[PDB]
Scaffold this active site. Sequence first.
Site, short mmCIF file in Angstrom:
data_model
loop_
_atom_site.label_atom_id
_atom_site.label_comp_id
_atom_site.label_asym_id
_atom_site.label_seq_id
_atom_site.Cartn_x
_atom_site.Cartn_y
_atom_site.Cartn_z
N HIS A 1 41.25 53.80 38.90
CA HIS A 1 41.90 53.47 40.16
C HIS A 1 43.01 52.46 39.94
O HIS A 1 42.94 51.64 39.01
CB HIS A 1 40.88 52.99 41.23
N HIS B 1 33.78 43.31 35.40
CA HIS B 1 34.49 44.03 34.35
C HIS B 1 33.90 43.68 32.99
O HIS B 1 33.24 42.67 32.81
CB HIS B 1 35.99 43.66 34.35
N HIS C 1 38.39 42.95 50.75
CA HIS C 1 37.80 41.63 50.46
C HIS C 1 38.38 40.99 49.23
O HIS C 1 38.61 39.80 49.18
CB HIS C 1 36.27 41.73 50.41
CU CU Z 1 32.94 42.26 50.25
CU CU Z 2 36.61 49.29 40.00
CU CU Z 3 35.83 47.49 36.86
CU CU Z 4 37.96 45.44 39.38
#
Ligand code: CU
Ligand code: CU
Ligand code: CU
Ligand code: CU
Length: 499
Positions: free
Chosen positions: A110, A402, A458
Amino acid sequence: AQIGPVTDLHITNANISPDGFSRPAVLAGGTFPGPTIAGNTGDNFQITVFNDLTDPSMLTDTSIHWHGLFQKGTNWADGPAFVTQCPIITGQSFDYNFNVPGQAGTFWYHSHLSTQYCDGLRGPFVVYDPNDPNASLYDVDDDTTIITLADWYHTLAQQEPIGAAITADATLINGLGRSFTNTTASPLSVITVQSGKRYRMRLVSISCDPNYLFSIDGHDMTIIEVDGVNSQQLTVDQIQIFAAQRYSFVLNANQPVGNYWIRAQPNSGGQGFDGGINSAILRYEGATVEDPTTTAPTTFSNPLVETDLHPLADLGVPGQPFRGGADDPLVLNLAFANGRFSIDGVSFVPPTVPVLLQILSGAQNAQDLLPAGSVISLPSNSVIEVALPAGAAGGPHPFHLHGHNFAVVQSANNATPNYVNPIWRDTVSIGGTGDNVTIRFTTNNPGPWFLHCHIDWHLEAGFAIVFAEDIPDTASANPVPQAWSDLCPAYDQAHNIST
Ligand SMILES: [Cu+2]
Ligand SMILES: [Cu+2]
Ligand SMILES: [Cu+2]
Ligand SMILES: [Cu+2]
Ligand SMILES: *[C@@H]1O[C@H](CO)[C@@H](O[C@@H]2O[C@H](CO)[C@@H](O)[C@H](O)[C@H]2NC(C)=O)[C@H](O)[C@H]1NC(C)=O
Ligand SMILES: *[C@@H]1O[C@H](CO)[C@@H](O[C@@H]2O[C@H](CO)[C@@H](O)[C@H](O)[C@H]2NC(C)=O)[C@H](O)[C@H]1NC(C)=O
Ligand code: NA
């Protein structure tokens, strides 16, 4: 067709009408969702991203994150803007060149600039296992067995007020669905199965915000994978899937030949199924081409509960079997007020110089790093515990880390921790008021790793921090290509920024 592991990927603007309403979008590969990027475990991926964007209303810069892939030694390829790179500018391209050792499962990609992925830049990313320990549980596993769930908005993302409760206009299943208001009988997605065969359905939430109650009338679902992690078989009749999570489940095509509704009810936006909103069609080969006539139950008797999930492998839990039983035990203060989120008193606002570049230029403690108060250092080769107590408005918040997956030592809506055999995953609902969802992992991956709520609105309103893991070894562990070193000079020149 699937593309990869070596491929070009063009990012363009185009008009699309996935619910009958036309709007411009930001697309990978000319489609919503984007094409599936795929390879086998341990492969070298080289995804050369061509930024061809020209419409400033959805941003003409971009950056792409490979969600759930650890990027060990390749932190510069992770994608979050102003954490690991400056954005790619229009008319330029960038080779994300990385490897996927030791991972196999269902992922996605993404945009990771602002709220740009909401405008369309989202697609599946599958790492197959030629020796999959679950292979004997199904017959079919291919591009036709991927099921994406997406929220879709008629208003462009850069026109959504920061910190607002922003609500979608359609649920899209495999890119198609019907609008909640002004509903038109636009085409629904069809998933086709053959009576008697077993399918590995790869369920991917590409949501920017809502969680979905996912079910298939007449069918149950046997979970075998959670966010890339193989699970023991768990049979359920409904899955509540939060933004960015993934499940593989076995679908046994064991019902009479016919048409069955596939249901994905979001927590906000349109409720129910009137006019065929929140719906797709499961069609058996040989069935009449017509809409299903099936009913949902009033209540689901075997819904997924996260504490029922357990890894297929003996993964255990690192550390000691009590709260604070880790080398570096943390408790984050997660809050919301006045349109902005904060973590430990600081609302995240992206820095001018990406965190990784600040560290490669010599900044070597977390108090030298910008944004001030938004970077926490983690020690190397250490067990980390992070408690994420809920209560902040806009929940339930799906927190994502991550560079790592993590043991879910405590889940939503259950006060009891599990130090023996909890599931490992990469995105976790932190639950509701009074909960204390808690994660653990070990630090064996030097670099700056984003931690944030995966409701993209958010994140934009500041609900993030950076874990600067093993600052001292970041530079030696993550040699950078010239093209990466070129990104910030090009971006800052194009935007008239001085740094
Ligand atoms: Cu949130
Ligand atoms: Cu993600
Ligand atoms: Cu990620
Ligand atoms: Cu991320
Ligand atoms: C969530 O669990 C954490 C521990 O993982 C709790 O943290 C303790 O908080 C108290 C004050 O609230 C401190 O005195 C301790 O130093 C913390 N660490 C411990 C006991 O190991 C936190 O309170 C819990 N939050 C909720 C809402 O239940
Ligand atoms: C609440 O979470 C706890 C911990 O994950 C669950 O407790 C386990 O329950 C299983 C299944 O009965 C037992 O095998 C384990 O020994 C339990 N572990 C612990 C540490 O108690 C519990 O089932 C969950 N509650 C609900 C209602 O599902
Ligand atoms: Na252990």
